[PDB]
Structure 1
Amino acid sequence: PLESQYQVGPLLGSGGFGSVYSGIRVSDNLPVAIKHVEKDRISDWGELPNGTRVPMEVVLLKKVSSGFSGVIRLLDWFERPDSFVLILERPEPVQDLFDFITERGALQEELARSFFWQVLEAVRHCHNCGVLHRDIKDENILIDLNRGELKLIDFGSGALLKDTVYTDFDGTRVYSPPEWIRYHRYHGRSAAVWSLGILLYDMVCGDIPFEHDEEIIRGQVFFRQRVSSECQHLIRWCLALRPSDRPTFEEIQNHPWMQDVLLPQETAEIHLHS
């Protein structure tokens, strides 16, 4: 074992998530992402079923890794004196949703429907596993371009799912709900639905709807692109000011705009040119 198991390629990126390198597993040529997180830079810690002290990110990733391909899976992890190394799966070719939107602008509704539906299934999987991502946004969504499959990344600001109030939030501000801005308090599910509202607007308009605190609190949504009445309704419902007025995941998926979604492979053939 140790670090004989992987061949380290080029740097893919770095930021609040750490430093991530392209990699290959020598056991079977499998593409992987090798993410290094410094110990002195993590605030949230937890324990694994085995009973070890690891970054919360690892706890959460282990809980959501398995069968479902809607989340980038943790294949293994290692501990070093000053850091933790995470071996994640690496689809290829791939592009994150932020870059995808920057390049193509506002997405056609058929495409946004397929993408949004997949994000919903991924978030449901997380929540079923007892995990709350807390930073759902375009930058944290990877598109497997050949299969048309979306994958959720970066659980570094996540938390165990609970039914009581959360008083901490280290996720992206502009995707944060009015109740966090005004009271420094939110519940998991309704805060997640707010972020999904921001994400859907972003997909169909090419940018997020709110820039400033005052705009988030006012909750008035202006559309900069042509968007169907049904899509506008769903977005406005997800962005309801009162947490209890937002839809549940089931209500989102049963909404008229969400019906007749394309399959991932279909989405890729029609829109990603597979």
Structure 2
Amino acid sequence: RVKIGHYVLGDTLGVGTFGKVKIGEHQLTGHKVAVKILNRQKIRSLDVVGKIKREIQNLKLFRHPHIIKLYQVISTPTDFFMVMEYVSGGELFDYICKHGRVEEMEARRLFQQILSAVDYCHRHMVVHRDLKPENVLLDAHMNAKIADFGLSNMMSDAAPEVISGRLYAGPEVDIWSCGVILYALLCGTLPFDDEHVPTLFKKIRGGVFYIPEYLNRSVATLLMHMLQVDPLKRATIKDIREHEWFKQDLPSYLFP
């Protein structure tokens, strides 16, 4: 039975190749944290210790309202314990699968939050790591929160360049990923989806996708720019910020 200060560790929230994430609850106040436990022997055997450490150091410097906070790091001879901000609302894509597509203004509100967090990553994350849609969570206030907790590996109930075999620029792949997130928010499904795998890949490389009748031309053009197959032709975050659909009701705090 494990305690960090007043936090009693309980259920496992997520698990990955590198460790597990357990919810901690403050015995007095009920405050919750998410404790990422990294077993030294496992991360050594995967040869990822250097990458992970450099990730921890960078996360100390992150201050964005839609990216998971790191509160402290405890090091023992056998484990690292990263005490992080708790998120209660699960994965965004699970919410979309359960509840269907999101009303247009809510889609926009969430997407503005997500794109701001990605822009902050491109600006402040020293080594780039591709955004994974399964890392976009929802917090108690129905705000987007980017976190790497391995929720998607728990069971209860790619960009054209990624599949090209070539090295690529990470920030460009992130725009494509954000385009699928936006499409999913708006349509309740993925823009390229097919149970026949070669056809899924042909669809991703072909860049043609379905726009439901209920979406306006304006947002369709934004999605088209973000989902351009050729990165040389794809929207940047600046382009997206300038788009009339995205600009609507955009809080200034998101892009300072």
Cα RMSD (Å) of the superposition? 2.7
Q: 1:18 to 1:225 in 2, by over 3 A?
A: farther
Q: 1:99 corresponds to which residue?
A: 94
Q: 2:183 corresponds to which residue?
A: 201
Q: 1:119 aligns with which of 114, 121, 124?
A: 114
Does the 8 Å contact 2:68/2:145 carry over to 1? Answer: yes
Q: 1:170 corresponds to which residue?
A: none
Residues 64-143 of structure 1 aligned to structure 2 (within 5 Å): 64=62, 66=63, 68-91=64-87, 93-131=88-126, 132-137=128-133, 139-143=134-138
Does the 8 Å contact 1:194/1:238 carry over to 2? Answer: yes
- Cα offset, 1:24, TM superposition: 2.8
- What is the CA–CA distance in structure 2 between the aligned matches of 1:17 and 1:111, rounded to whole Å? 34
Does the 8 Å contact 1:78/1:86 carry over to 2? Answer: yes
State the AA in 2 paired with 1:214.
K
Q: 1:37 corresponds to which residue?
A: 38
Q: 2:140 corresponds to which residue?
A: 145
- What is the CA–CA distance in structure 2 between the aligned matches of 1:143 and 1:107, rounded to whole Å? 13
Q: 1:46 aligns with which of 47, 50, 58?
A: 50
TM-score, structure 2 normalization: 0.78
- 3-state DSSP class of the match of 2:90? strand
Tell me whether 1:23 sits opposite 2:21 in the alignment: no
Does the 8 Å contact 1:201/1:207 carry over to 2? Answer: yes
Higher alpha-carbon deviation: 210-219 or 96-105 = 210-219
- What is the CA–CA distance in structure 2 between the aligned matches of 1:178 and 1:209, rounded to whole Å? 13
Identity of aligned residues (%): 30
State the AA in 2 paired with 1:141.
V
- What is the CA–CA distance in structure 2 between the aligned matches of 1:106 and 1:4, rounded to whole Å? 40
- 3-state DSSP class of the match of 1:126? helix
Q: 1:15 to 1:248 in 2, by over 3 A?
A: same
Q: 1:126 to 1:83 in 2, by over 3 A?
A: same
- What is the CA–CA distance in structure 1 between the aligned matches of 2:20 and 2:163, rounded to whole Å? 30
- Cα offset, 1:192, TM superposition: 1.1
- What is the CA–CA distance in structure 1 between the aligned matches of 2:227 and 2:146, rounded to whole Å? 21
Does the 8 Å contact 2:108/2:246 carry over to 1? Answer: yes
State the AA in 2 paired with 1:117.
Q
Residues 252-271 of structure 1 aligned to structure 2 (within 5 Å): 252-261=240-249
- Cα offset, 1:97, TM superposition: 0.6
Residues 169-248 of structure 1 aligned to structure 2 (within 5 Å): 176-211=158-193, 212-223=200-211, 226-248=214-236
Number of residue equivalences: 232
TM-score, structure 1 normalization: 0.74
- 3-state DSSP class of the match of 1:183? coil
Does the 8 Å contact 1:107/1:203 carry over to 2? Answer: yes
- Cα offset, 1:25, TM superposition: 4.8
Q: 1:62 to 1:155 in 2, by over 3 A?
A: farther
Unaligned runs of 5+ in 1: 48-53, 157-175, 264-274
- 3-state DSSP class of the match of 1:94? coil
State the AA in 1 paired with 2:144.
L
- What is the CA–CA distance in structure 2 between the aligned matches of 1:214 and 1:115, rounded to whole Å? 30
Does the 8 Å contact 1:143/1:151 carry over to 2? Answer: yes
- What is the CA–CA distance in structure 1 between the aligned matches of 2:145 and 2:48, rounded to whole Å? 23
- Cα offset, 1:74, TM superposition: 1.0
Judging by fraction of residues, say which structure has more helix: 2
Does the 8 Å contact 2:129/2:170 carry over to 1? Answer: no
- 3-state DSSP class of the match of 1:230? helix
Does the 8 Å contact 1:74/1:86 carry over to 2? Answer: yes
